[PDB]
Every structure is written in structure tokens, then in C-alpha cells.
């Protein structure tokens, strides 16, 4: 059942293999959802606080620990029985990934304890949801949870794509410098609506008696592949004018000189609409609801002018069997002006 | 399902024999877009979506790329770059009852047109006028759905048709749905034609020394063309070169 219970620099982390194509000894320019370089990453941690965070366009997640506190995640919208939600939980032997109409707890967790104080026999109480009805997807595989664990979560094109990397580091309070690309872990053919997520923690009872979250953005990256096809470096093309130059020249080095790398353009701040100040409506109804229509050989022509034409009244009507527009979109008609209209 | 609440079945990791459907005498409509119906058994897809619903005969034409109308606009929209097949048949003997079958609904009114493969099953009152409806239907406040009321004596255009739309997913990813096309022995060090899980071409296949990662299915050169593949049965990495040629 349910039980009631800072920022750091992203540096150059959060880069993953954008596709499943082998490349080597080459600089490849790719546009994808990446964690921007030197971005603001939120740092999360007696008290308990494990908040539900927005997913936005995708999430960069990382944690440093030897205690295996982070066990899984919940992804979804309402995170209740009203909608489908994705549950990812890792245990000692397997990872369980399910999509169900879960009724999640406000403070979901796995309660860790030693069975009758046998330290060689650990057990856990699964307290994440109260129900899991109408499951549409289930997947079970090998588990993937000083030790820095990085993940990238994308929800796109019918797939929930997870990338990961596991490396040792010599710091706790922040993310490491240097470059390491995350490799695709699993592509889940789920196809659900995700706007929010939260981390599932393993909590020893004695704890109540850290991880980093960044967001992905549509950015252009220049990725450097070494001879073994490993991504060893990258340039965030929108980070600064130098990175922009590097991407323009398709190189990680720039020679002395002046380069044209982009175009500067002042953007509009307002939309100014100026139409003739008339209120009289165009007499379309008088055409459509005429008692008598002409024969096609002697068709009638009504000239319409100097009026306001609301075409959505006609288009959104259930009474017409045919409504075909040529040279113009039926949904853009109310934004257009004409010199004349013939009916 | 009703067309406003159409069903989507995800098909993967299987052998798809499409000639069984195409060569059937039981379908009245079988229109393919972005692909030839007679080449389907030679193709591999990353995924296949089968969307099923009921509409009336006259509306079957709306189930196509670049179409307009109540169905195309408010119920089931296909993309202009749609790759797939639209299959339909008359179901008057199943989906029509004397006095009318009012189980099959469609969306008649909507604030805006649907995006491709968007599914809208809300029943919020539609505001046709400028005055808020506040959930109460009446003048200029419409119930967005309507029934077909299928009857066995209706003209063909008003008879129920069962529609299945097979959307073919073609991404740069491992293909999981392939035709009945049989495999052959792998031949190396010769000029051959080849087809690797849908990837066709001509050249010489050799053992690769490229350090492919477990997730990588094929490689490309600086020209961005396939120059290596992972054999879908042996997981062997093969290098691809063109068959010897030159000017004379």
C-alpha cells in the first residue's frame, strides 16, 4: 500500500549516439534533442523530498552512488488510474518495464530492509502503486542499475528511447568534466503521452528515523567519431560564436581568420492587424437558403462586396455533403481579404 | 471501433504476408500509397500499425492522403507522406440492424482539424457561436458526435464499411516485420546482388574489421552511403564495396 513520507553545470555531458549507424574517423553534424553544453542542471537529494518533475521534450538523468538508491522511474501525465503510465523498475536480476493504468502513490518507493536482520538476505516492499489495471505493454530484461550512472529519456515517434552510460568518477558534489557518449539501452514501442516523471528510490527504514536532472533541447551538434566508431568529442553549435564557427567549418579546430557563420535578424515583437472597420455580414445565407435555385444552364450569379465574410459558418456546417476549395484552404478563408466574391 | 475512436494495433517481430490480403476477393478497396502492393512481400519495416474502424461507403474515399471532409478532418487523418495501404470492405451484413445500428459514431464538429494519426474521443459540447456553452447543448452548442444509424436497406453510400489502414514505418532502425521472402546462403569475396533485412544493393561482401557496437546495424562512409552491414542471422559484420569498374 501507499506510505506517506541547487544547480550544477552540465559541462559536456548528456551526449548520446543519435542513431544506430556506425561511423568512424569522421565529423558528423546531427540535429537532435541534446542536453545543451554548460546548461543548468537541477540537483536533487531528517527529511524526505522526491518531487514530480516535468518531462518536457526529454530528460537527462544522472546519479552518483554506491548504495543503489535509484531503482527506477515513473513516466506519465496524471500519474493515476485515469491514463496510461510507464513504470521502470530495476531489481537484483531483472528490469521490469510496464505500461498500465497505474494508481501511483504520492511518495512511491521500494522499502528496503534486511529479512529478520539477516544482512546477507535483503528484501524489499514494493510500494509504488495501489493498482495496475489494463496493462498494454510489458518488457523484462537485464538490470541496468563513485559510480556515475547517466540516462537519457526520449519520448518520440512512438518510442520511449533510453540511452545510458556507467562510469567511475572522483567527485560527488557535481558532474565530471571530459566527454563520454551514452549508448542506446532499449527502444520501447510504447507510444504514450508523457509530460511528468519521478524517480523511484530504495529507502532503508533507518534513512527516515542524490541525482541530477537536465532537459533536452533541439540543438545542432557536431559529433567526432574516432577510428573505432566511438564518439569522443562534440560541439554544441549554439553554445557560443566559436562553437558556431567550428560547426560551420565542420572542424574542431579553427584557423586564424574571419568567418561568416550566421545571420543576425531582429525578430518581431507584436502582430499588427488592420482590416476595414465594417460590421455588415456578407449575404451568403441569402444564396444558400433561396427558395428556388436556377437551372445549371442558366445559373445565377450573385456579386458579394463591401462586407464581412465568415466562411467557418459554412465550412463547419453539418448540412453540406461537398465542400471543396481550390487555390485556397477552407481553414484560412477567415484570414483572407478579396476584392470581390461571386456566388 | 467507431471512426472517431479508431483502434490501433501495433504489429512487430513477425512475418507479414501481404499477398494473402491483396489477392483476396473479399475486399472492395485496396489502395497503397508510397509503396506498391505487389512489392510488399519484398520489403521490411520497423513497425506496422493496423488502424481499424467503421465508416459509411461514401466516406471511404476520405481515407487517403490529401483528403478533406468530416472523416478526414475530425476523425481519422492520414499524413500526406503516408506509406501504407487502405483496405475496406462492405460490412452491411454485420454492422447494420433493422431500425438502425447506432453504435457507430463519428465526429461531426471540432474546433480544428486533426493532425495525422491524432485520436480525439472527447465529447465536450462544441461552441458554434460566440456564446460559451458551459457544457449545455442548445442553440449554437452542439453535441460533437453523431451516429451513422446503419440499416440493411440503405444505399451503398450509406452502408457500413470496415476499414483497415496498414501504416508502414520505415525508420533507420532494425526491421522487425518482413515479408515471406526466403533467405539464402551468405556469399563473400564475389560480386553479388544482396538484400540485408530490406537493404538492397550490388557489391562484394567481405568480413569487416570495423568495431561495430552491439546496437549498430550498418555503417556509412564519409559519403553517407552504406559501406557495412550486420548480417541479420549471424550478426557478422560485413564490409561492402562496389564491383570492380572503371572507364574504358
Amino acid at each position, epitope marked *: 500500500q501507499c506510505v506517506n513520507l541547487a544547480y550544477t553545470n552540465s559541462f559536456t555531458r548528456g551526449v548520446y549516439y543519435p542513431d544506430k549507424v556506425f561511423r568512424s574517423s569522421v565529423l558528423h553534424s546531427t540535429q537532435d534533442l541534446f542536453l545543451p553544453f554548460f546548461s543548468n542542471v537541477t540537483w536533487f537529494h531528517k527529511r524526505f523530498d522526491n518531487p514530480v518533475l516535468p518531462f518536457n521534450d526529454g530528460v537527462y538523468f544522472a546519479s552518483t552512488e554506491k548504495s543503489n538508491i535509484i531503482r527506477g522511474w515513473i513516466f506519465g501525465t496524471t500519474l493515476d488510474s485515469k491514463t496510461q503510465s510507464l513504470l521502470i523498475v530495476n531489481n537484483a536480476t531483472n528490469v521490469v518495464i510496464k505500461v498500465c493504468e497505474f494508481q501511483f502513490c504520492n511518495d512511491p518507493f521500494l522499502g528496503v530492509y534486511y529479512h529478520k536482520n539477516n544482512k546477507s538476505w535483503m528484501e524489499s516492499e514494493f510500494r509504488v502503486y495501489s493498482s495496475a489495471n489494463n496493462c498494454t505493454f510489458e518488457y523484462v530484461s537485464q538490470p541496468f542499475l563513485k559510480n556515475l550512472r547517466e540516462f537519457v529519456f526520449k519520448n518520440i515517434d512512438g518510442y520511449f528511447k533510453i540511452y545510458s552510460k556507467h562510469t567511475p568518477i572522483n567527485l560527488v558534489r557535481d558532474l565530471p568534466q571530459g566527454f563520454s557518449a551514452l549508448e542506446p539501452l532499449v527502444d520501447l514501442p510504447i507510444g504514450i503521452n508523457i509530460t511528468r516523471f519521478q524517480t523511484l528510490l530504495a529507502l532503508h527504514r533507518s534513512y527516515l528515523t542524490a541525482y541530477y536532472v537536465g532537459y533536452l533541447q533541439p540543438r545542432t551538434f557536431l559529433l567526432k567519431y574516432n577510428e573505432n566508431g566511438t564518439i569522443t568529442d562534440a560541439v554544441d553549435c549554439a553554445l557560443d560564436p566559436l562553437s558556431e564557427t567550428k560547426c560551420t567549418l565542420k572542424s574542431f579546430t579553427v584557423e586564424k581568420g574571419i568567418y561568416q557563420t550566421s545571420n543576425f535578424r531582429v525578430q518581431p515583437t507584436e502582430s499588427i492587424v488592420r482590416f476595414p472597420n465594417i460590421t455588415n455580414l456578407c449575404p451568403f445565407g441569402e444564396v444558400f437558403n433561396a427558395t428556388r435555385f436556377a437551372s445549371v444552364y442558366a445559373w445565377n450569379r450573385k456579386r458579394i462586396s463591401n462586407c464581412v465574410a465568415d466562411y467557418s459558418v459554412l465550412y463547419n456546417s453539418a448540412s453540406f455533403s461537398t465542400f471543396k476549395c481550390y487555390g485556397v484552404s477552407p481553414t484560412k478563408l477567415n484570414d483572407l481579404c478579396f476584392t470581390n466574391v461571386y456566388a | 471501433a467507431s471512426v472517431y475512436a479508431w483502434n490501433r494495433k501495433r504489429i512487430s517481430n513477425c512475418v507479414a504476408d501481404y499477398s494473402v490480403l491483396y489477392n483476396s476477393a473479399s475486399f472492395s478497396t485496396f489502395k497503397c500509397y508510397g509503396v506498391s502492393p505487389t512489392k510488399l512481400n519484398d520489403l521490411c519495416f520497423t513497425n506496422v500499425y493496423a488502424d481499424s474502424f467503421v465508416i459509411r461507403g461514401d466516406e471511404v474515399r476520405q481515407i487517403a492522403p490529401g483528403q478533406t471532409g468530416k472523416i478526414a478532418d475530425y476523425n481519422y487523418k492520414l499524413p500526406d507522406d503516408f506509406t501504407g495501404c487502405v483496405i475496406a470492405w462492405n460490412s452491411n451484413n454485420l454492422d447494420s440492424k433493422v431500425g438502425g445500428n447506432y453504435n457507430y459514431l463519428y465526429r461531426l464538429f471540432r474546433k480544428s482539424n486533426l493532425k495525422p494519426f491524432e485520436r480525439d474521443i472527447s465529447t465536450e459540447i462544441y461552441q458554434a457561436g460566440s456564446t460559451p456553452c458551459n457544457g*449545455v447543448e*442548445g442553440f449554437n452548442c452542439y453535441f460533437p458526435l453523431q451516429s*451513422y444509424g446503419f440499416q440493411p436497406t440503405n444505399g451503398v453510400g450509406y452502408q457500413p464499411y470496415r476499414v483497415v489502414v496498414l501504416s508502414f514505418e520505415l525508420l533507420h532502425a532494425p526491421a522487425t516485420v518482413c515479408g515471406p521472402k526466403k533467405s539464402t546462403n551468405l556469399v563473400k569475396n564475389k560480386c553479388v546482388n544482396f538484400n540485408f533485412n530490406g537493404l538492397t544493393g550490388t557489391g562484394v561482401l567481405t568480413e569487416s574489421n570495423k568495431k561495430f557496437l552491439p546496437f549498430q546495424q550498418f555503417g556509412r562512409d564519409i559519403a553517407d552511403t552504406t559501406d557495412a552491414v550486420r548480417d541479420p542471422q549471424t550478426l557478422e559484420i560485413l564490409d561492402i564495396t562496389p564491383c570492380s569498374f572503371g572507364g574504358v
Partner: nanobody
Amino acid sequence: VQLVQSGAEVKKPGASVKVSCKASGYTFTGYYMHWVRQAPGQGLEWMGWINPISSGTSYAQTFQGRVTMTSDTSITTAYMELSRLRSDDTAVYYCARAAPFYDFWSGYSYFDYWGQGTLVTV
């Protein structure tokens, strides 16, 4: 188009009467079903309507709170239940068809088909 109503009813004051109207010959859910009352020697009075597709209703202020309209599309039948009957509820009750409010040519403004009236005596 046919509208067939139930037979005559005799009720006591305080009792409730439910009058049915079976529709045929048209798409049941494509029209509103209205009820119109005609007391002896009197004219026609509109009671309200039901929209079978949504089971949405609207009632005349005269009957609001006493009349409940329902329908069952599986048998294309509309119902009107008038509770807390009074002696002045003695009338012939008609069901009538009219277009829905979204009808372009205002077919909702009038009643094109009527059933045979059902007499209720109180």
C-alpha cells in the same frame, strides 16, 4: 417517417405517467424529439426536447422539475415522464420530430412529424 406513441393512461393526482414514442423510417439520433401537450379545448404547448445521441434535454419552464425525458436508441424510442400529476395535466401528449440545432436551414424551429397523441387523464 413514423412516430408511434403508447396508448391512453388514467392516473391519480400525485402519480407519474411515462409516455413512449417509437420512431422509425429515419436516423433516430439525427433529430430531436420534442413533446407537445394539448389540454382539452386548448392549444398546443411545448414541454421540452431530448437529443437521443447525447441524452441532452431542455424543458419548458412550465414543466421543468416535473418532466423527465429519456431515450433508448437501441429501440429508437423516446420517453417522457411527467411526475406529480395534477388534474390540469389531463391532456393529449404528442411526440414530434425536429432537426437538431446545428441544422443549417433552421429545421429545428418547427416540427415536421408528429405521432398520434397519447391521452393522459388525471
